[PDB]
Design an enzyme around this catalytic site. Structure first.
Site, PDB file in Angstrom:
ATOM      1  N   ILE A 181      43.171  15.553  26.893  1.00 56.26           N
ATOM      2  CA  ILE A 181      43.580  16.317  28.104  1.00 56.26           C
ATOM      3  C   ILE A 181      42.320  16.807  28.797  1.00 56.26           C
ATOM      4  O   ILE A 181      41.557  17.568  28.151  1.00 56.26           O
ATOM      5  CB  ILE A 181      44.489  17.507  27.733  1.00 56.26           C
ATOM      6  CG1 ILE A 181      45.872  17.037  27.250  1.00 56.26           C
ATOM      7  CG2 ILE A 181      44.593  18.502  28.888  1.00 56.26           C
ATOM      8  CD1 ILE A 181      46.736  18.107  26.568  1.00 56.26           C
ATOM      9  N   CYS A 182      42.190  16.470  30.080  1.00 50.02           N
ATOM     10  CA  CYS A 182      41.223  17.106  31.005  1.00 50.02           C
ATOM     11  C   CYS A 182      41.848  18.412  31.483  1.00 50.02           C
ATOM     12  O   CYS A 182      42.695  18.392  32.409  1.00 50.02           O
ATOM     13  CB  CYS A 182      40.811  16.211  32.169  1.00 50.02           C
ATOM     14  SG  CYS A 182      39.062  16.420  32.601  1.00 50.02           S
ATOM     15  N   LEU A 183      41.480  19.499  30.807  1.00 48.94           N
ATOM     16  CA  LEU A 183      41.944  20.853  31.160  1.00 48.94           C
ATOM     17  C   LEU A 183      40.793  21.843  31.006  1.00 48.94           C
ATOM     18  O   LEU A 183      40.117  21.823  29.948  1.00 48.94           O
ATOM     19  CB  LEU A 183      43.153  21.204  30.290  1.00 48.94           C
ATOM     20  CG  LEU A 183      43.789  22.585  30.491  1.00 48.94           C
ATOM     21  CD1 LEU A 183      44.016  22.895  31.968  1.00 48.94           C
ATOM     22  CD2 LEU A 183      45.114  22.687  29.751  1.00 48.94           C
ATOM     23  N   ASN A 231      44.253  12.505  34.124  1.00 47.65           N
ATOM     24  CA  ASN A 231      43.618  13.525  33.234  1.00 47.65           C
ATOM     25  C   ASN A 231      44.054  13.377  31.759  1.00 47.65           C
ATOM     26  O   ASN A 231      43.804  14.329  30.982  1.00 47.65           O
ATOM     27  CB  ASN A 231      43.926  14.956  33.699  1.00 47.65           C
ATOM     28  CG  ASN A 231      43.522  15.228  35.127  1.00 47.65           C
ATOM     29  OD1 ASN A 231      44.235  14.845  36.048  1.00 47.65           O
ATOM     30  ND2 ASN A 231      42.379  15.866  35.300  1.00 47.65           N
TER      31      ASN A 231
END
Lengths: 373, 156, 275, 153, 314
Positions: D85-87, D78
């Site tokens: 950031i994959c959030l 991620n």
DNA sequence: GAACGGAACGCCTGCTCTGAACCTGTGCC
DNA sequence: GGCACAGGTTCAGAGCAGGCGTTCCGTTC
């Protein structure tokens, strides 16, 4: 002023009309005391013919009157108005009134005048019908003025039974090569707080113009949004960009095309302003599955040129989100989604290509070439 | 061409009445010449054209002759009576043609029929209206027509 | 209460007095009829009474032909030569207008769905009984105001409703196969009794011809021009949609109905006297 | 304005009570944006690493989430080669999960949670999301070597 | 072959990612619609969502047809059991919200929805529309575009309703034949009633409708039966609609009574005895409202010399 | 198989229906 | 002969319904 105000309790019935004439005598002789005179004449006992006379004798000197007094003046005109003295006074009224002329106290009482006119025309259909029938009968002249526009928007904002009739009249007027830029420029540059009152009705009319054919109509549906966005506060700006994103996510291609051109226009216009609401431009990426590659090339171009306005490289946030969703869509198996990614990627490469930016386009074009090999 | 004819006024000269009555009779003989082709050329598309343009030409005659005819009747009665009895001879062939689209229970033909019949009966009672305006409503006779095939038979 | 015994003996008494006594006061005669109709409508559909009245009119006023012997006083006694002409003519017609509107909304709703069988049967019984009504007024020699012109305009509506009934049976018979014997009988009865008497009566009024502001005179006559053309139009579309049924139900109902009676005019040698 | 009233409690709350393995101070280079240090999650290959993040506070914050990147290079499913950031709580509804019931700490806790627990169903790096899943030790080797060259001292 | 009833939603979620033709989507959705009877209420909403992300790329008519016929049936169950609300109303609200959110991304469905719900001939409306579909429409009112069409639609829908009634009383003949089918009178009233579970998308259109009715068919005839009675019965509805949105919705009744006197006052060009008798029953139930709305009452006295005797007197 | 003539749905308008008032015929003292 | 009810008639004007214009599909050589 107080004697005037008390004259109705004082005078006996033989000596009403007498006083009447000599009060009209005082009226031409002093302006300052227009208001209480008027109030008096209307709380006297008189003959209506005389009241017509004095009302014209208002109307002739109405350029000479300080603005503060106008509302109750024009309230008087629109209670002395009959069903039959409608267009007469209205055409005369519509002529003599200026609203270019008046302009910090000026603007406030202009607004309060409009409140008072709203309450008049709100409050008798007599005026609304005839008012319109008096603006359509001014399709002749290219020269009909700021008041006629602002007044239309107003009757659509307030009066409900007429909505079709206003739209009919506005469409038969606007196609005719009447109302154009020059009118809207002056309207929205001068009367912008009167119009920020009526924010609903503006954007209601702009939406109803996007759903017709005839590029002239849809051009006006565009422009109405344009001037509201350029001029109004941050609240109404958010509401403007709102209706356009409603068209993109939602509508059929015509609406979609139109709105995309408009966002494209507004961002080369004011990068900083759209920057505030640029979250709602990214909010279209929910429903990429409802929109065609043509429109997708244009959308990725508009977002990408917003991001590659140079001053807004502090706000790289949208740029990095898009970089992200690109590698995400590329990394789908399904050809439909990889295609969306490829288009966006090459558009973005192109706009940012116009040494670290060279390495950025290098990496992006290498990764699309690698996913797509 | 015939729909671009304007009907005049009574105040307009008798010269312009007679030139338009001449121009009408040119169109009414061109129409009878075209209708008389049907018998020797019986087909689907040629019948569809004449059922259609029969009534469409009858309507040009209803709007742009019949106003000229109430004006120019007391002066040019014989011209107008000749023009109308010329149309009557192909009127009868459109009634017989309506016979053919009925008997040959032919749907492509029978579409334009109800209007043909109504548009023709409009022109009948518009003549009665003309005689009413010229104060001789007592002169309008009417009477039925023998049901022929196109050629001229008595189909019974 | 419409079904109370006292309501029904009231309706019976009204009917009896309308059937017995003459009374040459006009609006009185009109009124004991209006009463009787308003009583009857709440008890059952009013076509039996209308047919009885059309038969008294046929008896009283004569016929187009000048050689048919008819007299049917026995049905209703508050119907005179003096009374019936601008009086009970209008009444009987207005009650048909309504009856036909009842049946046409019924048909409209039946066509919505696609329960049916008893619906069509009662429609057809109504239409057949008031056809015995329309036939008996169409035979008669009726006075020539709106008395005749209201009949004409209602005979337009008669055929329109039948055109719609036809178009419903087109939706059924293509799928399954029918036009039950009641509907074939109906279209035969419309051919034998009504349609040729239309043409006998149209010609009888048209030929029938017995100070005037020019515009109003033109407006009068251009009002009078429409209803005969639109009777032709209405019957032509009846016959026309009977063609579509004939072909796409494999029974030519054009066997019962005749070829279209078509008209040519004349002008006589009276124009030369007057001008 | 609201930016000031949130940031006031948050700067103060990240000096006085920051989450475990985490710090956040008003940056000495950048006296507007925040510097965080998230110390490598326990029993993850990030053990012995000190991971610097820049937290960009948006203008209409707290109506928009914070904007965070790993400034220390991180080998992660991620997180990509540029620290993206994959959030969910880095985006707004419906794609994301930011709302005002959250704050810079709750997300920086959720960041140390993602360092320890990479999500293989939101891959930015398909090579690392696959390696993480199918050769855990090669991911953990490479991420621990990563932690020794870039997150070390 | 029959589908696992627990995982019909879940199997329908796999079809989402694979491509289908028109007949394929028709079959998958019609089995998923056969599955609606044999399940519990509250798994229906996400399943309806799963049907619609499929339906957007093919069959959409079928989805709405099915949802509407199904919930019509279930609403009938509630009514004839009354002659089970507090789960039903919640799930209904959520489903209405889902289909409104879908119409927000596909306006075509909007249009196909309205086309499906057409009156047309007077018989189609009597099996098209329901207390649920009305609920649906008055919710669609929320989106600017369809306000107009929907309101006209309901409006004429409404009048038809009365023409149907009047006709059927007058004669013996039609009463026999027709079994008395729900009039859109009684259906909408039940809609107002079941906004109490507080579907507050609904209410704006209800206020909107009730007024429109009081606008269009006011007695201006009076400053027979056919031009008088089915045009009394439009506002007498209007009146009951707005009386019940006021007596049920506490938030609203400020704009309701604002807009009533808006029309009572400066008018008196067209009469307003019906508005006065609305106003009367509004304030008589709960005058307490009137104390937040004094602003208008102060500017009503303003013009209380130009209003005639009977406006002011009452 | 392909070329011709009819079926389908969004827009505009003419026809119809109504209702309101005025006026001209005619009914009675 | 004079006046007033009656009904005819005439016009404003609201609303409805169908035929066209742009486009697809069955039918016949």
């Amino acid at each position: 002023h107080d004697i005037i105000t008390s004259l109705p309790e004082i005078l006996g019935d033989s000596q009403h009309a007498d006083v009447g004439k000599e009060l009209s005598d005082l009226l031409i002789e002093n302006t300052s005391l227009t208001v209480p005179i008027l109030d008096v004449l209307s709380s006297l006992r008189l003959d209506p013919n005389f009241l017509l006379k004095v009302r014209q004798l208002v109307m002739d000197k109405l350029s000479s009157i300080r603005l503060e007094d106008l509302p109750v003046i024009i309230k008087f005109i629109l209670h002395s108005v009959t069903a039959m003295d409608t267009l007469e006074v209205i055409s005369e009224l519509r002529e003599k009134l200026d609203l270019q002329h008046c302009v910090s106290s000026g603007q406030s009482c202009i607004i309060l005048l409009f409140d008072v006119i709203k309450s008049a025309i709100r409050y008798e259909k007599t005026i609304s019908e005839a008012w319109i029938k008096a603006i359509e009968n001014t399709a002749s002249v290219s020269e009909h003025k700021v008041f006629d526009l602002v007044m239309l928007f107003i009757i659509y904002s307030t009066n409900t039974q007429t909505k079709k009739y206003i739209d009919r009249v506005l469409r038969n007027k606007i196609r005719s090569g009447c109302i154009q830029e020059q009118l809207l420029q002056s309207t929205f540059s001068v009367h912008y707080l009167v119009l920020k009152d009526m924010c609903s009705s503006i954007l209601s009319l702009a939406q109803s113009l996007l759903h017709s054919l005839d590029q002239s109509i849809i051009s006006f549906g565009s422009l109405l949004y344009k001037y509201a966005f350029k001029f109004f506060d941050t609240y109404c700006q958010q509401e403007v960009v709102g209706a356009l994103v409603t068209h993109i996510c939602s509508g059929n291609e015509a609406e979609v095309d139109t709105a995309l051109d408009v966002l494209l226009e507004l961002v080369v216009l004011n990068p900083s302003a759209m920057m505030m609401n640029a979250v709602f431009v990214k909010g279209i990426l929910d429903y990429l599955d409802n929109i065609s590659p043509q429109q997708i090339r244009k959308l990725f171009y508009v977002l990408s040129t917003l991001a590659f306005s140079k001053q807004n490289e502090a706000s790289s946030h949208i740029q990095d989100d898009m970089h992200l969703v690109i590698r995400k869509q590329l990394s789908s198996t399904v050809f439909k989604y990889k295609l969306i990614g490829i288009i966006g990627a090459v558009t973005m490469a192109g706009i940012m290509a116009a040494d670290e930016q060279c390495t950025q386009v290098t990496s992006l074009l290498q990764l699309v070439h690698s996913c797509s090999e | 061409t015939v729909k671009k004819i304007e009907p005049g006024t009574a105040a307009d000269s008798q010269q312009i009445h007679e030139e338009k009555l001449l121009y009408w009779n040119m169109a009414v003989r061109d129409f009878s010449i075209l209708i008389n082709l049907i018998k020797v050329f019986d087909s689907h598309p040629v019948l569809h054209v004449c059922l259609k343009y029969g009534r469409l030409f009858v309507e040009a005659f209803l709007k742009q002759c019949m106003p000229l005819l109430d004006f120019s009747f007391r002066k040019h009665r014989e011209d107008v009576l000749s023009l109308l009895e010329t149309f009557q001879l192909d009127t009868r062939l459109l009634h017989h043609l309506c016979g053919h689209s009925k008997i040959h229970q032919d749907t492509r033909l029978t579409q334009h029929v109800p209007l043909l019949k109504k548009t023709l009966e409009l022109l009948v009672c518009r003549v009665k209206a003309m005689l009413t305006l010229n104060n001789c409503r007592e002169a309008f006779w009417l009477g039925n027509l023998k049901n022929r095939d196109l050629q001229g038979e008595e189909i019974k | 209460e419409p079904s109370s015994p006292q309501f029904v003996q009231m309706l019976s008494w009204t009917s009896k007095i309308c059937k017995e006594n003459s009374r040459e006061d006009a609006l009185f005669c009109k009124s004991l009829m209006n009463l009787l109709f308003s009583l009857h409508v709440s008890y059952k559909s009013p076509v039996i009474l209308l047919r009885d009245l059309s038969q008294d009119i046929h008896g009283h006023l004569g016929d187009i032909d000048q050689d048919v012997e008819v007299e049917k006083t026995n049905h209703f006694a508050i119907v005179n030569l003096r009374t019936a002409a601008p009086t009970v003519c209008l009444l009987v017609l207005s009650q048909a207008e309504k009856v036909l509107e009842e049946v046409d909304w019924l048909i409209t709703k039946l066509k919505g769905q696609v329960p049916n069988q008893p619906v069509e049967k009662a429609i057809i019984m109504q239409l057949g009984t008031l056809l015995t009504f329309f036939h008996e007024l169409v035979q008669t020699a009726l006075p020539s105001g709106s008395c005749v012109d209201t009949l004409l305009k209602d005979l337009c509506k008669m055929y329109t409703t039948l055109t719609a009934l036809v178009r419903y049976y087109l939706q059924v018979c293509q799928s399954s196969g029918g036009i039950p014997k009641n509907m074939e009988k109906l279209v035969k009865l419309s051919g034998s009794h009504l349609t040729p008497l239309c043409y006998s009566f149209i010609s009888y009024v048209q030929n029938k011809s017995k100070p005037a502001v020019v515009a109003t005179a033109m407006a009068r006559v251009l009002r009078e021009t429409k209803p005969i053309p639109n009777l032709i139009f209405a019957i032509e579309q009846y016959e026309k949609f009977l063609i579509h049924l004939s072909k796409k139900s494999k029974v030519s109902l054009m066997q019962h109905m005749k070829l279209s009676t078509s008209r040519d005019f004349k002008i006589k040698g009276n124009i030369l006297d007057m001008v | 304005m609201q930016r000031a009233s949130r940031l006031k409690r948050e700067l103060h709350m990240l000096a006085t009570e920051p989450p475990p393995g985490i710090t956040c101070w008003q940056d000495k280079d950048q006296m507007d944006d925040l510097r965080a240090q998230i110390l490598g999650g326990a029993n993850t290959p990030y053990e012995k690493g000190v991971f610097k993040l820049e937290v960009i506070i948006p203008e209409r914050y707290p109506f928009e989430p914070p904007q965070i990147r790993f400034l220390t290079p991180i080998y992660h499913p991620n997180i990509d080669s540029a620290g993206r950031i994959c959030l969910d709580v880095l985006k707004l509804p419906p794609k994301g999960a930011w709302r005002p019931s959250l704050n810079i700490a709750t997300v920086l806790t959720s960041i140390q949670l993602l360092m320890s627990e990479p999500n293989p169903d939101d891959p930015l790096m398909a090579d690392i999301s696959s390696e993480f899943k199918y050769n855990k030790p090669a991911f953990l080797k490479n991420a621990r070597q990563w932690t020794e060259k870039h997150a070390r001292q | 072959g029959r589908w696992d009833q627990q995982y019909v939603i879940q199997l329908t979620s796999m079809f989402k990612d694979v491509p289908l033709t028109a007949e394929e989507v028709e079959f998958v959705v019609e089995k998923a619609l056969s599955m609606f009877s044999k399940m519990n209420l509250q798994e229906i909403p996400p399943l309806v969502y799963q049907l619609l992300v499929l339906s957007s790329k093919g069959s959409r008519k079928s989805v709405l047809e099915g949802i509407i016929a199904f919930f019509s049936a279930l609403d009938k169950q509630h009514n004839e059991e009354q002659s089970p609300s507090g789960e039903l109303r919640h799930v209904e609200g959520t489903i209405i919200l889902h289909i409104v959110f879908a119409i927000k991304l596909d306006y075509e469905l909007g249009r196909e929805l309205v086309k499906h719900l057409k009156v047309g001939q007077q018989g189609d409306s009597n099996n098209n529309l329901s207390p649920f579909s009305i609920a649906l429409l008055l919710s669609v009112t929320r989106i600017q575009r369809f306000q107009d069409q929907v309101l006209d639609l309901l409006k004429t829908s409404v009048v038809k309703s009365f023409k149907d009634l009047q006709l059927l009383q007058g004669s013996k003949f039609l009463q026999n034949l027709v079994p008395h089918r729900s009039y859109v009178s009684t259906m909408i009233l039940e809609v107002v009633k079941n906004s109490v579970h507080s579907w507050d998308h609904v209410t704006q259109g209800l206020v909107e409708l009730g007024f429109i009715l009081m606008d269009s068919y006011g007695p201006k005839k009076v400053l027979p039966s056919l031009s008088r009675m089915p045009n009394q019965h439009a506002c007498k509805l209007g009146a009951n609609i707005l009386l019940e949105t006021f007596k049920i919705h506490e938030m609203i009744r400020q704009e309701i009574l604002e807009q009533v006197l808006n029309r009572v006052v400066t008018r008196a060009s067209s009469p307003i005895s019906h508005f006065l008798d609305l106003l009367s029953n509004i304030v008589m139930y709960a005058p307490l409202v009137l104390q937040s709305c004094s602003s208008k009452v102060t500017e009503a006295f303003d013009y209380l010399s130009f209003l005639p005797l009977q406006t002011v007197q009452r």
